[PDB]
């Protein structure tokens, strides 16, 4: 019944877009707003020429436990699944969460909203109300910052 709304949702989709790259100071600033952070900085997606992280890495740190979920973005073409490039997505419109990490996809209403089978719903049903509350707070704080 509760979901991610407004500024947080609009910035989640931009954060989860493929071409978003974060550098070191921004990564530390975002990581301070995680309550459930274990204090270990993850390996960046790009190590050379310069260390660059991706928004999917930070949101995978936000994701609690070992949630497994598959959703689709709102702009997902209907012909991608039938034809080739089914698991190598051109538009990054297929959300796949494996072992608590965001492998691919762009988050939107259809994955973080108040709909059945959402990431929030699976997080609740697999982890419990306390961990889902921490999930909500971490999403809002990190994305708003």
């Amino acid at each position: 019944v509760m979901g991610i709304v407004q500024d947080t949702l609009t910035a989640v989709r931009k954060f989860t877009k493929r071409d978003v790259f974060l550098e070191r100071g921004e990564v530390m600033n975002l990581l301070m707003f995680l309550s459930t952070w274990d204090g270990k900085v993850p390996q960046p997606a790009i190590l050379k020429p310069r260390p660059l992280w991706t928004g999917k890495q930070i949101f995978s740190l936000i994701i609690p436990g070992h949630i497994n979920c598959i959703r689709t973005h709102s702009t997902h073409p209907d012909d991608e699944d039938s034809g080739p490039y089914k698991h190598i997505s051109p538009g990054d419109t297929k959300v796949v969460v494996e072992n608590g990490e965001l492998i691919m996809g762009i988050l939107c209403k259809k994955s973080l909203g108040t709909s059945a089978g959402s990431l929030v719903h699976i997080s609740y049903l697999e982890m419990g109300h306390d961990i889902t509350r921490l999930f909500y707070s971490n999403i809002q704080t990190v994305i708003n910052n």
Binding site: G25, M28, N29, M32, D38, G39, V41
Partner: protein, 115 residues
């Protein structure tokens, strides 16, 4: 009727310590500095000076609430180097930078005026 007086944004009343240091038990060689009655003006400059030390692994600041006035600064350093030493070095370093900038600005004022 619930408006706080304007001096409480920067004045310590009786009982509060300015800085409190707590170690972080989740990872080794990490400490959290809690600074009262300060804001982004000191937080950002201390974080940016701390990020220039190659023996500092993690450095950041945050404000837990904009209505309250405190800063949490978490510093993680390599072993053989302590976060308190890193913080002291950063503050001394910034003071030296500001002194150099002040004297050069004074020289520039004296050059521009009647010269």
């Amino acid at each position: 009727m619930n408006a706080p007086p304007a001096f409480e944004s920067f004045l310590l009343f009786e009982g509060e310590k300015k800085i409190t240091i707590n170690k972080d038990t989740k990872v080794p060689n990490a400490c959290l500095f809690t600074i009262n009655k300060e804001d982004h003006t000191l937080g950002n400059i201390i974080k940016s000076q701390l990020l220039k030390d190659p023996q500092v692994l993690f450095a950041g600041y945050k404000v837990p609430h904009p209505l309250e006035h405190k800063i949490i600064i978490r510093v993680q350093t390599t072993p053989d180097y302590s976060p308190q030493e890193a913080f002291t070095n950063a503050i001394t370093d910034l003071i030296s930078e500001l002194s150099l900038l002040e004297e050069r600005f004074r020289v520039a004022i004296k050059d521009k005026q009647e010269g």
